[PDB]
Symmetry: C2
Subunit: 311 residues, 2 copies
Amino acid sequence: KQQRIGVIGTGAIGGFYGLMLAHAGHDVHFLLRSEFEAVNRAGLSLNSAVHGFRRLAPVQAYHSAQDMPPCDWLLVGAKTTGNHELAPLIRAAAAPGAKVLLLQNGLGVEERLRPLLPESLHLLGGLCFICVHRGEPGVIEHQAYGGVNLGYHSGPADERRRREIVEEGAALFRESGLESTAMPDLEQARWQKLVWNIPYNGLSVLLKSSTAPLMANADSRSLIEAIMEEVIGAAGACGFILPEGYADQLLAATERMPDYRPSMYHDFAHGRPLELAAIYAAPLARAAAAGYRMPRVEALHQALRFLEAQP
Amino acid sequence: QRIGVIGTGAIGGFYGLMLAHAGHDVHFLLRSEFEAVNRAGLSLNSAVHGFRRLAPVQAYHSAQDMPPCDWLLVGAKTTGNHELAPLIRAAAAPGAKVLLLQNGLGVEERLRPLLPESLHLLGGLCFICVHRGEPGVIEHQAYGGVNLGYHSGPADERRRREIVEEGAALFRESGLESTAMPDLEQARWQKLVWNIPYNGLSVLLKSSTAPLMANADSRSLIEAIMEEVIGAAGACGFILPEGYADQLLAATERMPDYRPSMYHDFAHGRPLELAAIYAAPLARAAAAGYRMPRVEALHQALRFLEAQP
């Protein structure tokens, strides 16, 4: 054990990164909200096209955060919908001055969790470009990618120490065989990830499709691109100019990608609440504050809200 | 005068029967359910006008068999208008009036090169909830009014107002609300404010009018789409009535749960009327330098859904 790592919320994201870190020799402890008794006896298994089959058995699984030991890094892989009840779990599992890394999508996530996080804890964001989902209980299906873009949000660190901490988190993933990048601007990096999540998550639910049919059809492809330009323009209006041709890079990488159902697709099929607040409502309100309209995203958001309310 | 119904669908059947029930001489052309009508007749189940039956009914299997008609009502889906052109020509009398009881934009101009220039081409915008039930049975749930406008033909401006008013009198004397519109293109834009949101969202959200109006998010979406259509119409010079969006929303609130034309078409595998209802007003708005992002996105999603198995 070089670093003790706690995983708050052990879904596909939390289980994957926690297992990859554990396979690198770190002491990883998994907090299970919904899957404890299954995962505890079965273990954690990884079906990965990138890294091959991996397994962690037995798992250091816990059903209550108080049972967990003080960890140096807390990785939150849970959905942003349960972030309001996250603070007592993090505080219960955190070693003094622990680093909290939200492996979560959307916008404004860290800012909404900080009020109830002790000032002595560092708060970081991690934007995961990864194709992963839950198969059988305790089994993790990894189809592609896995890179993590880390950014610092808040905490007791000065500017030099902030860069060192982000670099430290990136080294954890890199030594685990995962690509990872220290980002200089977490909020800019969150806008960059929205360019993929906003069209693909919502259209996969709305059109009940996956990435390959969405990219194959010419009309859905133009719709994705127009939505991407809305997010790019909303980011620009709020002060963040994204890389040139960023939409083309996302479109090109998604074509090469295997057929993938986004996490929101799985959420809707399993009846789980969709991450509309972080992925849609928050960027819509930020753009509205800057006087920038996102008509397709706003309509896509209204449709998803309708679909979630329908029987 | 003599009235022919080219394609006795839900629209043509309803308006043909109402005209015939008022004493007019109506001649129905049946293309795919001639067998059932030519015995039992045509029956109407109307929550407004009640139960009416036409028996016997002047039914024809071929447009060649029909007598020359002075009025030709066309109520079929716009996708088959090209195939319908020989039918209209065969049943048309000299100087006949062709009334396209069809939705969308640019419908008459796309049919005009296939019709003789001696014929008058009119548009009829039907604010009506109607669908085919049993063979020979027309189910009418609400409304039924027709707004008539002149498109093309040999008539001068004075003769154009007389012909539109003559057609409006046909329907009004049959017990239907009907208005003569001075601008057919403006009249088509105002009907698009309903068809564009309700027809597409009913397919996209797999919903009908009542659940779309009961949910606040779908209602906000419909209103935003309506404002895009109102803005695109104004960008092309046509000022729509004040509070027109709230007007349509109010009439949709009162009417019973309705599955639009496009919903039934998508469910039964029929090709959707995307060209006339979405592609044409989008291209017309683009030429006027006005964007309709929600309508464009809606059109793209519908085309995707149509291409899916």
